[PDB]
């Protein structure tokens, strides 16, 4: 099926405390495999999945230097964005960056993306054509002009279509027994009385992978897909016999229909 | 596999 590698970055400036708090995480589909924390003691990229630990020290050395360069750029960005908007030097601010590449069923390049935010608001983003930037305001238009000067979109386009995809195939291959093995949701139903005439039936979906799943009572109330803590996911949908629990997941050859009994 | 340091500042 389709797969994706995504990287998330967060740098929170702290006035009077020197270096901003830089945190980075990497994902392969709904699985985190690398992390970095500027406040950690190792001061290097650390694995977060068993299969990624098959890489020698040469891999972790280059990834540690590259993630430290990302923090060095976000540090200058926070200082520049403070001047672009003319903000106080005693206030805290946040910059967030995310990018990644997706592949299809043939494991060839499908789409890429890159977004940047400041204080939780959209700042600049790469368009789907991977050749133009969408600027939010005048400060972002200055940045778009700055990036169009050195053709940053051309260099990022070459990474998403080449290096990002090739290493995604290597991650899927080395993580074959986990990244390519779907987990079917273990299903059970619960019944409760909430009114003098109406009741509530809650359909549970637990311990499934990937995270995407659809639960509806078609011819309601459902919460967000939450992590169980062991790599799997959880979700439930409730309603207060014209509609039953329709469970649809990639790990099920046919959808599951359950009714109270 | 992180990309190279080709992104300049803002």
């Amino acid at each position, epitope marked *: 099926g389709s797969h994706s590698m995504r990287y998330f970055f967060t740098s929170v400036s702290r006035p009077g405390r020197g270096e901003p708090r830089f945190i980075a995480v990497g994902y392969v589909d709904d699985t985190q495999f690398v992390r970095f924390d500027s406040d950690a003691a190792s001061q290097r990229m650390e694995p977060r999945a068993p299969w990624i630990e098959q890489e020698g020290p040469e891999y972790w050395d280059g990834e540690t230097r590259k993630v430290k*360069a990302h923090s*060095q*750029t976000h*540090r*200058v960005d926070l200082g*520049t964005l403070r001047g672009y908007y003319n903000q106080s030097e005693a206030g805290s601010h946040t910059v967030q960056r995310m990018y990644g590449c997706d592949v299809g069923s043939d494991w060839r390049f499908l789409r890429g993306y890159h977004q940047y935010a400041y204080d939780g608001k959209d700042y600049i983003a790469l368009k789907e054509d991977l050749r133009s930037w969408t600027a939010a305001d005048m400060a972002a238009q*200055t940045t778009k*002009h*700055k990036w*169009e*000067a*050195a*053709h940053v979109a*051309e*260099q990022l386009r070459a990474y998403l279509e080449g290096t990002c995809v090739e290493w995604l195939r290597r991650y899927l291959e080395n993580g074959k027994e986990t990244l390519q093995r779907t987990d079917a949701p273990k299903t059970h139903m619960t019944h409760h009385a909430v009114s003098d005439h109406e009741a509530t039936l809650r359909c549970w979906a637990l311990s499934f992978y990937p995270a995407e799943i659809t639960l509806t009572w078609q011819r309601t109330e459902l919460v967000e897909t939450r992590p169980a803590g062991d790599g799997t996911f959880q979700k439930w949908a409730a309603v207060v016999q014209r509609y039953t629990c329709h469970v649809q997941h990639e790990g099920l050859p046919k959808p599951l229909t359950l009714r109270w009994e | 596999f992180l990309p*190279s*340091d*080709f*992104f*300049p*500042s803002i």
Partner: antibody
Amino acid sequence: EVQLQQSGPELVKPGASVKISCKASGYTFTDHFMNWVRQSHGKSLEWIGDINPNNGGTSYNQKFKGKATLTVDKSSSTAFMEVRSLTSDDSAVYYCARRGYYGSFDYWGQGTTLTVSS
Amino acid sequence: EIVMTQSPATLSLSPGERATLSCRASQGVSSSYFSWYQQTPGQAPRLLISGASTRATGIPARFSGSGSGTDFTLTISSLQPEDFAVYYCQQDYNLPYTFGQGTKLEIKR
């Protein structure tokens, strides 16, 4: 061969305005940003600003916001810089440096000497 | 504004020796946006080394660059008659783009 032909020297009086031209040839003009750099006598270099030759978009050094203005003409492949309200401190050598596709100033003009005196 | 500082101001060496020039940046700069320039008195500057280490088109193989973070270095393998001029460093990494104060290479006699 990339060739940046600039204008000749100019002696002007204070409070006047001069306009330097920079003729580009030997490459695709719309593929590279054009920058402008000033160098005073016995002094180092200072980036004034750049201009996108496709849409005329510009960025400036904060010191030159209101002193120099950048324009381009895609027809003749020429980049212009107009320096207004000239004083004796504006007397220097001005260059137009092409921006490399991925960075740096890969090619420079021969320079244009400006002198502001009464 | 990232400030670039070069050391020393003047460097007296003899034809045929190595030359190591330093450029300290006040802030961390990506090596992909650091450059070296040579300017002979009377002429215009010329790009020598881009990307902290990549040699520009037409620059002799005796010029080599390195460095990272806040410390960059320009190396000349063998000082030749033309290689006695003023050398500048710059950053195109954060607006405004800034240069260094320069470093003159003087013939030692």
